[PDB]
From a paper:
The two [name] protomers interact head to head to form a dimer, and the dimeric interface is formed by extensive polar and nonpolar interactions. As [name] is an [name]-decapping enzyme, we identified key residues, including K8, K94, K95, K98, K175, R221, and K243 located on the substrate RNA binding interfaces of [name] which are important to RNA binding and decapping enzyme activity.
To investigate structural insights into the catalytic mechanism of [name], we determined its dimeric structure by single-wavelength anomalous diffraction (SAD) phases using selenomethionine (SeMet)-labeled protein. The helical domain (residues 36 to 124) forms a globin-fold-like feature composed of six α-helices (α1 to α6) that connects to the Nudix domain by two hinge linkers (linker I, residues 32 to 35; linker II, residues 119 to 139). The Nudix domain (residues 1 to 35 and 125 to 250) consists of a central curved β-sheet (β1, β2, β3, β4) surrounded by five α-helices (α7 to α11) and several loops, thereby forming a classic α-β-α sandwich structure. The Nudix motif located in the center of the Nudix domain is highly conserved and comprises the loop-helix-loop architecture that contains the Nudix signature sequence extending from residues 132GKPKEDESDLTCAIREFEEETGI154 in [name]. One interface was composed of four α-helices (α3 and α4 from each A and B protomer) from the N terminus of each protomer. The other dimer interface was located at the linker II portion of the C terminus and one solvent contact surface of the Nudix domain.
Numbering used by the authors:
A (entry chain A), B (entry chain A): 6 to 248
Write the structure that this text describes.
Amino acid sequence: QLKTSIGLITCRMNTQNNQIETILVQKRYSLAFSEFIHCHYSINANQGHLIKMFNNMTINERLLVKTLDFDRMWYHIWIETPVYELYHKKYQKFRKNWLLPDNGKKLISLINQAKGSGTLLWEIPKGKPKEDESDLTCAIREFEEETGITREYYQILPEFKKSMSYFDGKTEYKHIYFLAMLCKSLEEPNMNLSLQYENRIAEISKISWQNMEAVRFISKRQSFNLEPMIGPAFNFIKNYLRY
Amino acid sequence: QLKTSIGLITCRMNTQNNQIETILVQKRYSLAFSEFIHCHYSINANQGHLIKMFNNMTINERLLVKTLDFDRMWYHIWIETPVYELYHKKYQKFRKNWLLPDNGKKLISLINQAKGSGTLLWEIPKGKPKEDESDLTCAIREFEEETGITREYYQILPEFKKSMSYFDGKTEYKHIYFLAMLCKSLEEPNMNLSLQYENRIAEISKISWQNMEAVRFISKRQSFNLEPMIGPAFNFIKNYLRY
């Protein structure tokens, strides 16, 4: 099939240096954890995944799994949003895998034997377009759903549009990116994260300005490499700022 | 008074580059969170702290506080180690601050109004010496309590010893550091973190080799600056490796 996400690259010049920075966001939890409490694994096939899943969670996440209070695990991703059917499907699939048969003991054992720890991803804010939206409207909406940064702080630069496509697993994920330049100054965007706006924090743990060296530094340390999108983003910024 | 911690700086040469790296560890939770469930704050004095404490927690931590299940907050730091008296002291101090008076509503409100998010520290493994120990014995013991890295992997370099002293708050914290060079190769130290060794994970979320640029990068982004200890550590390594 074709999974397609659309995001926005928002940049500024932090006047202290002659350096272009962009907004990246960090995820609160790992994919591995999310795959676990949504049961994206089988207990009859693919052992090697079951082992990788547990290893690629953070230590805190594993500690949550060691609890066996699936509700506590659910809260970590959902934070009390009401999905009962979703909940109870996953809960019963959870109950039949390690509570009925072995009473946790295989799960708990697998948790203990799990070695190392995962890494929470830095990403360009991106999302899935609503049915009646233009690409750019999705990008705008998703960008400030995720950062509180409203329209009056940036100007869309219309003639930029980059598109990565992935199939490392497999199907095809198309990632499309517009570009924005900041105008009203905004020195501390990580300050828009607050538990009262439960959708900025549903998935984000940090918002932050990142120059290029930060972009490269983070990319050496996570599977998702994001120089191919910030590289051209910043180049386009430079050529724009000249004129 | 004189608070004194003693740690060990363990280095290697990752042959791929001509680059010296050292072991740093990351904390699982923030000081702000730990100050909160141990009641290192007053509700009658120092409002400005109460606000900073909440802001300097991670989003997950705040979500734990938004639970009001103090036991769930306790588990985050203690992971079921038996301290009942400690627990019940802190629980009752917790109960009388926001459960009795306002039934959470001021605490929950303060949580919601909390803006931004904290950062979990990267540190050189360090600890507090037992009563009958030499400095170096504390450093050795604490180093592999915290990383699983036993004695046969490194050689102590005896003629290095660095000592920082802090009083930004205030009292005096003396931080003393020995130096070790790796010998048996150890390509992936983050693999020693596992919930079966509950004391390596009690406080650590990642172990990792860091070259100098990583050291500087992390230091621009956390209050604890650690170039003054790795700087001389690496210099001493270089001069050692020559001869």
